[PDB]
Design an enzyme around this catalytic site. Structure first.
Site, PDB file in Angstrom:
ATOM      1  N   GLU A   1       9.911 -13.361 -20.074  1.00 31.45           N
ATOM      2  CA  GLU A   1       9.990 -14.495 -19.136  1.00 31.45           C
ATOM      3  C   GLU A   1      11.328 -14.499 -18.407  1.00 31.45           C
ATOM      4  O   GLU A   1      12.328 -14.065 -18.954  1.00 31.45           O
ATOM      5  CB  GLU A   1       9.831 -15.805 -19.926  1.00 31.45           C
ATOM      6  CG  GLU A   1       9.779 -17.105 -19.108  1.00 31.45           C
ATOM      7  CD  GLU A   1       8.610 -17.107 -18.139  1.00 31.45           C
ATOM      8  OE1 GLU A   1       7.441 -17.504 -18.507  1.00 31.45           O
ATOM      9  OE2 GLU A   1       8.913 -16.670 -17.000  1.00 31.45           O
TER      10      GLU A   1
ATOM     11  N   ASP B   1       5.811 -14.199 -22.994  1.00 32.27           N
ATOM     12  CA  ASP B   1       7.191 -14.670 -22.843  1.00 32.27           C
ATOM     13  C   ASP B   1       8.180 -13.787 -23.624  1.00 32.27           C
ATOM     14  O   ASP B   1       9.332 -13.569 -23.158  1.00 32.27           O
ATOM     15  CB  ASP B   1       7.309 -16.130 -23.350  1.00 32.27           C
ATOM     16  CG  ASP B   1       6.643 -17.108 -22.390  1.00 32.27           C
ATOM     17  OD1 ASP B   1       6.858 -16.949 -21.192  1.00 32.27           O
ATOM     18  OD2 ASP B   1       5.902 -17.975 -22.834  1.00 32.27           O
TER      19      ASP B   1
HETATM   20  O1  LIG Z   1       7.763 -23.045 -16.457  1.00 30.29           O
HETATM   21  C1  LIG Z   1       6.866 -22.569 -17.147  1.00 30.29           C
HETATM   22  C2  LIG Z   1       6.463 -21.073 -17.074  1.00 30.29           C
HETATM   23  O2  LIG Z   1       7.038 -20.292 -15.995  1.00 30.29           O
HETATM   24  C3  LIG Z   1       6.694 -20.639 -14.703  1.00 30.29           C
HETATM   25  C4  LIG Z   1       7.164 -19.849 -13.671  1.00 30.29           C
HETATM   26  C5  LIG Z   1       6.828 -20.130 -12.351  1.00 30.29           C
HETATM   27  C6  LIG Z   1       6.002 -21.187 -12.023  1.00 30.29           C
HETATM   28  F1  LIG Z   1       5.701 -21.433 -10.680  1.00 30.29           F
HETATM   29  C7  LIG Z   1       5.494 -21.989 -13.049  1.00 30.29           C
HETATM   30  C8  LIG Z   1       5.825 -21.687 -14.376  1.00 30.29           C
HETATM   31  C9  LIG Z   1       6.272 -23.277 -18.192  1.00 30.29           C
HETATM   32  C10 LIG Z   1       5.468 -22.568 -19.036  1.00 30.29           C
HETATM   33  C11 LIG Z   1       4.844 -23.140 -20.149  1.00 30.29           C
HETATM   34  C12 LIG Z   1       5.006 -24.432 -20.485  1.00 30.29           C
HETATM   35  O3  LIG Z   1       4.371 -24.928 -21.572  1.00 30.29           O
HETATM   36  C13 LIG Z   1       5.827 -25.197 -19.654  1.00 30.29           C
HETATM   37  O4  LIG Z   1       6.044 -26.503 -19.941  1.00 30.29           O
HETATM   38  C14 LIG Z   1       6.453 -24.615 -18.517  1.00 30.29           C
HETATM   39  O5  LIG Z   1       7.261 -25.342 -17.722  1.00 30.29           O
HETATM   40  O1  LIG Z   2       4.040 -17.809 -15.159  1.00 29.98           O
HETATM   41  C1  LIG Z   2       3.124 -18.577 -15.469  1.00 29.98           C
HETATM   42  C2  LIG Z   2       2.058 -18.912 -14.373  1.00 29.98           C
HETATM   43  O2  LIG Z   2       2.194 -17.806 -13.419  1.00 29.98           O
HETATM   44  C3  LIG Z   2       1.819 -16.553 -13.892  1.00 29.98           C
HETATM   45  C4  LIG Z   2       1.928 -15.427 -13.082  1.00 29.98           C
HETATM   46  C5  LIG Z   2       1.555 -14.183 -13.598  1.00 29.98           C
HETATM   47  C6  LIG Z   2       0.986 -14.023 -14.862  1.00 29.98           C
HETATM   48  F1  LIG Z   2       0.535 -12.601 -15.394  1.00 29.98           F
HETATM   49  C7  LIG Z   2       0.818 -15.147 -15.650  1.00 29.98           C
HETATM   50  C8  LIG Z   2       1.209 -16.382 -15.146  1.00 29.98           C
HETATM   51  C9  LIG Z   2       3.157 -19.242 -16.714  1.00 29.98           C
HETATM   52  C10 LIG Z   2       2.524 -20.467 -16.981  1.00 29.98           C
HETATM   53  C11 LIG Z   2       2.653 -21.091 -18.235  1.00 29.98           C
HETATM   54  C12 LIG Z   2       3.452 -20.479 -19.233  1.00 29.98           C
HETATM   55  O3  LIG Z   2       3.684 -20.982 -20.489  1.00 29.98           O
HETATM   56  C13 LIG Z   2       4.121 -19.305 -18.956  1.00 29.98           C
HETATM   57  O4  LIG Z   2       4.885 -18.747 -19.928  1.00 29.98           O
HETATM   58  C14 LIG Z   2       4.010 -18.720 -17.699  1.00 29.98           C
HETATM   59  O5  LIG Z   2       4.621 -17.527 -17.477  1.00 29.98           O
HETATM   60 MN   LIG Z   3       5.067 -19.647 -21.740  1.00 25.50          MN
HETATM   61 MN   LIG Z   4       5.711 -16.941 -19.319  1.00 24.45          MN
END
Ligand SMILES: O=C(COc1ccc(F)cc1)c1ccc(O)c(O)c1O
Ligand SMILES: O=C(COc1ccc(F)cc1)c1ccc(O)c(O)c1O
Ligand SMILES: [Mn+2]
Ligand SMILES: [Mn+2]
Ligand SMILES: O=C(COc1ccc(F)cc1)c1ccc(O)c(O)c1O
Length: 181
Positions: free
Chosen positions: A65, A93
């Site tokens: 991540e 992640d």
């Molecule tokens: O911010 C994220 C994950 O990474 C992101 C990255 C880009 C985006 F447009 C939205 C989400 C996120 C993932 C899981 C989760 O449970 C949570 O509260 C989050 O904010």
């Molecule tokens: O990044 C996202 C949503 O956007 C993505 C973009 C590409 C992917 F292969 C997977 C998700 C995301 C949402 C929830 C979360 O917990 C998290 O870790 C994410 O990376």
């Molecule tokens: Mn996540």
């Molecule tokens: Mn993620």
């Protein structure tokens, strides 16, 4: 009482490396942090939880991540080639070098069992381990295996409570909480 700005909160209370990664992430996915400031806060929170989880045992975990997407996939592909782990369908992640599996971390204020079920239904692996944290201190993880010990997890939960508490004292919590999904 005064109602603060969420962007102000994030820039003051998250470390600058986290904030920069969050900004870069939002730009990569074509989003303005000025109209999606609750999301900016959620991305920073989630990233911080990923970093804390990794830091609980330094070098046990590769972080996926927070990297730009092309780079994240090259890392995942390298790990799969090296360790022979099955390739996941969505970017996870972390990779746990000790238990030999990718990990998906969730941060939520929804009911943790439902959130867990939606995550599990989304990723469709019997390999990737899921670990959910709620701002209530509740947590849920694949096969009741919590990976880290209680004090590492307590540090994460305490950080979540602190964020929640500072948001609330700024009048920011209600909207942030409602913004989920
Ligand atoms: O911010 C994220 C994950 O990474 C992101 C990255 C880009 C985006 F447009 C939205 C989400 C996120 C993932 C899981 C989760 O449970 C949570 O509260 C989050 O904010
Ligand atoms: O990044 C996202 C949503 O956007 C993505 C973009 C590409 C992917 F292969 C997977 C998700 C995301 C949402 C929830 C979360 O917990 C998290 O870790 C994410 O990376
Ligand atoms: Mn996540
Ligand atoms: Mn993620
Ligand atoms: O997904 C989110 C917020 O994610 C959260 C995740 C966990 C929480 F406890 C609170 C919020 C989001 C917020 C504002 C917005 O405009 C947007 O598009 C979002 O996806």
């Amino acid at each position: 009482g005064p109602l603060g700005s969420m962007e102000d909160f994030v820039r003051q209370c998250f470390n600058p490396m986290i904030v920069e990664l969050a900004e870069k992430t939002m730009k990569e996915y074509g989003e303005d942090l000025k109209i999606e400031t609750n999301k900016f806060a959620a991305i920073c929170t989630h990233l911080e939880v990923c970093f804390m989880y990794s830091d609980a045992s330094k070098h046990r975990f590769e972080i996926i991540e927070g990297r730009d997407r092309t780079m994240a996939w090259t890392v995942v592909n390298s790990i799969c080639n090296t360790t022979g782990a099955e390739k996941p369908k969505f970017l996870p992640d972390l990779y746990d070098y000790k238990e030999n599996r990718f990990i998906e971390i969730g941060v939520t204020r929804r009911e943790v069992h439902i959130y867990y079920l939606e995550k599990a239904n989304k990723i469709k692996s019997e390999k990737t381990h899921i670990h959910i944290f709620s701002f209530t201190g509740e947590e849920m993880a694949t096969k009741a295996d919590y990976t880290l010990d209680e004090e590492s997890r307590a540090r994460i939960k305490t950080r979540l409570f602190t964020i929640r508490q500072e948001m609330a004292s700024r009048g920011l919590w209600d909207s942030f909480r409602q913004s989920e999904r």
